[PDB]
């Protein structure tokens, strides 16, 4: 029987500093006296882990959380209120879900189509003691997996990592003593693998299961309970293994410039000097496409709006060439009753080129319109107007009862006999005008092409560009080059384009590469200080924050995107060092007469 415990609204979140926690043994491989670099899903250092108070002191708030790419879970309790977890997607009888419950003697893991309660919990009764899982779910069917082992679970701090990769649900755990409250401890401790379950189910959401004592919802009581939840990310770590195969330390390579240097050098100690650790690249912000204006549109209207159309047995043809075929004009027209295309889609026509276009036209009955197609037979299809099975082109038609019909019968239109079209004829008997656009594509120069769409021109920014088919990436600026009237773009001595004429304005623009270069970290040495300065080589200081993607970095890395201390040198942009007007012996060389040293802070 399910009861309603979550009668209170959700409380606001609290956060704790992870410091250095959530690191686990990435595999079952023995490594000793070695620094190993691994890429895996880890809890980032010094991240904000959410601190939940499922039972506050009798406020019950024990929410369903997202699983994302794996979860770090921790708790500090002696009351044994936390017993287990539910993992799954829908978390109802529609899908398989994973139920992990620990108890006094064992741990029971089941995967079934569980129908869970709205706010599920483990029922504990005292008589001896009794436990009931019927307060977690009302029923379970189609069980696919079952596993039973020993229990998974100052004060004791329990840490777990939950991953679900390639159908395997991996659990890591560690149990340590702690004498702190309302926080997570400082220091390093790696989590050893606990179990690997070959389950093969999808997990997107999970919920912590608590035990409540029977001493209806108002009859369930338990003491205060709280836990921490973090999330794993694709991170590179440098792990330090000691002589016994135990991980004793670790570096989060994306935490800061110093950690990045350590991971590059594969060492937890860095000597005084300057090291290149990475590179920056400026990315394009817009895509710019420019073409010449439209000079000549194809004379299709001359066919569709013809005063008179030919008879079906003697259909007329117009040749279309040396023009721009804006087919969207006819396709989006409300003046047509039908528009069908074979071998080509009517919505792609504006992007195509043909060697010839032909427009065939005639007058037929409504019940004859269906005959104007590939694979057709009939009086018209066979004797008057035949299209091939592999025909490429579009058949367009419309009613002409207000034009081609006459009182007494219009016998001017004939077929292989006269029609005798009348204004009072039924739909299938009324006259219809048909135009067929045949598209010829031979091994020859194109004569008909659709219109080219152009965008606005952007200057002084890193963009992608396309100038009349000439493509590339770079920065477009006004040029002082003098092109001859027939020259469209220029090249340097290396045969690379460095200037283009804008096809609409005829303005000459210079093309420069989007800023790029190395990133070097300047350090006094970790035996002296953990202060660093970062040099951005061959870049302007104004551009730095956008070259390193500051918004995608940690707060610690974002301090070095800019700041009060920004010094422009010939070597690049130096950030974090204070420039002085004194002169000393060179300590750490930067270039072009500039050196840096630690004097305490880093100076240039």
């Amino acid at each position, epitope marked *: 029987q399910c009861v309603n415990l979550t009668t209170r609204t959700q409380l606001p979140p609290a956060y704790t500093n992870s410091f250095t926690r959530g690191v686990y043994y990435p595999d079952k491989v023995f490594r000793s006296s070695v620094l190993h670099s691994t890429q895996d899903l880890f809890l980032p250092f010094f991240s904000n882990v959410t601190w939940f108070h499922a039972i506050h002191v009798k406020r019950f708030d024990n929410p369903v959380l997202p699983f994302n790419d794996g979860v770090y879970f921790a708790s500090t309790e002696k009351s044994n209120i936390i017993r287990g977890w539910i993992f799954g997607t829908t978390l109802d009888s529609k899908t398989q879900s994973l139920l992990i419950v620990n108890n006094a003697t064992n741990v029971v893991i089941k995967v079934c189509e569980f129908q869970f309660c709205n706010d599920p919990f483990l029922g504990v009764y005292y008589h001896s003691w009794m436990e009931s899982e019927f307060r977690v779910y009302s029923s379970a069917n189609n069980c696919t997996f079952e596993y039973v082992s020993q229990p998974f679970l100052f004060k004791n701090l329990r840490e777990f990592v939950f991953k679900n990769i390639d159908g395997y649900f991996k659990i890591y755990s560690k149990h340590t003593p702690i004498n702190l409250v309302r926080d997570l401890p400082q220091g390093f401790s790696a989590l050893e693998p606990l179990v690997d379950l070959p389950i093969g189910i999808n997990i997107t*959401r999970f919920q912590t299961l608590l035990a409540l004592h029977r001493s209806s919802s108002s009859g369930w009581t338990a003491g205060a309970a709280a836990y921490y939840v973090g999330y794993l990310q694709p991170r590179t770590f440098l792990l330090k293994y000691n002589e016994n195969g135990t991980i004793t330390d670790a570096v989060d390579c994306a935490l800061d410039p110093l950690s990045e240097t350590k991971c590059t050098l594969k060492s937890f100690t860095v000597e005084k000097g300057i090291y290149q650790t990475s590179n920056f690249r400026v990315q394009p912000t817009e895509s710019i496409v420019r073409f010449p204006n439209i000079t000549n549109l194809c004379p299709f209207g001359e066919v569709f709006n013809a005063t008179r159309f030919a008879s079906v047995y003697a259909w007329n043809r117009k040749r279309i060439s040396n023009c721009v075929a804006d087919y969207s004009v006819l396709y989006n027209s409300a003046s047509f009753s039908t528009f069908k295309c074979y071998g080509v889609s009517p919505t792609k026509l504006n992007d195509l080129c043909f060697t010839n276009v032909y427009a065939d036209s005639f007058v037929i009955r409504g019940d004859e319109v269906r005959q104007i197609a590939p694979g057709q037979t009939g009086k018209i299809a066979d004797y008057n107007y035949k299209l091939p099975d592999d025909f490429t082109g579009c058949v367009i038609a419309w009613n002409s009862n207000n034009l081609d019909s006459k009182v007494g019968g219009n016998y001017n239109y004939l077929y292989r006999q006269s029609y005798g079209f009348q204004p009072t004829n039924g739909v299938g008997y009324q006259p219809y005008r048909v135009v067929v656009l045949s598209f010829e594509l031979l091994h020859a120069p194109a004569t008909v092409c659709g219109p080219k769409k152009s965008t606005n021109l952007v200057k002084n920014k890193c963009v992608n560009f396309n100038f009349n088919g000439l493509t590339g990436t770079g920065v477009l600026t006004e040029s002082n080059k003098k092109f001859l009237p027939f020259q469209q773009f220029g090249r340097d001595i290396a045969d690379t384009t460095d200037a283009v004429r804008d096809p609409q304005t005829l303005e000459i623009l210079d093309i420069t590469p989007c800023s790029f270069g190395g990133v070097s970290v300047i350090t006094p040495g970790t035996n002296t200080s953990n202060q660093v300065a970062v040099l951005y080589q061959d870049v302007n200081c104004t551009e730095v924050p956008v070259a390193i993607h500051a918004d995608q970095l940690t707060p610690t890395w974002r301090v070095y995107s800019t700041g009060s201390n920004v010094f422009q040198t010939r070597a690049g942009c130096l950030i974090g060092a204070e420039h002085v007007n004194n002169s000393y012996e060179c300590d750490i060389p930067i270039g072009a007469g500039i050196c840096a040293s630690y004097q305490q802070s880093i100076i240039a």
Partner: antibody
Amino acid sequence: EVQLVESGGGVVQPGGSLRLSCAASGFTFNSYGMHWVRQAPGKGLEWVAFIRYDGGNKYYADSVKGRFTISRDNSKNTLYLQMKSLRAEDTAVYYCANLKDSRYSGSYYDYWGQGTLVTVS
Amino acid sequence: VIWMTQSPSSLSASVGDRVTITCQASQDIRFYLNWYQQKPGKAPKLLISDASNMETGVPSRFSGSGSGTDFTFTISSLQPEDIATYYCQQYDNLPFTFGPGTKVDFK
């Protein structure tokens, strides 16, 4: 407790650009994926974009692909939508939202902002 | 891309009447369909998730069911406060899509 506040709307010209932002509070923003949804005057709801909790994988509607970019700053609890080369057809009220999704975002709760109007003309 | 449609596009009903809205998918969205209720000037509110799972706070008069391509939303006893445009959303795969929306008016 939970709030989502859009801003950065206004009136721009065709071929121009506009960046929207949404301030999140009252929940663990950095644990959830986020969506943008737009609703033109007289029209229904159109899904625009989705970004995962870690700010990594990005998804867009076919109607905006190649023009719109979605991003987030998890240190400021702010969601962004960068739209460039906006056309008249892009006039709509733009919402930031946390849409309940048992398959992708893993959200168990459904939250919406107020909506900010963007006009292109 | 999965296309979504709704029928009728608009219906009128009085208080106490039973109101049903049909939503269809061009593909199999399994049970992955959200039902939203939107009133003028406000953001959409979720009433049902995963085809038939009611959201907390949603009146018992609201219900829904379906699987695959054919889903139904029902109000067992329409109230004056239930006048809104209802939308279906599929979330089987990205991009996510909404149906045209069905407007429920007052008889």
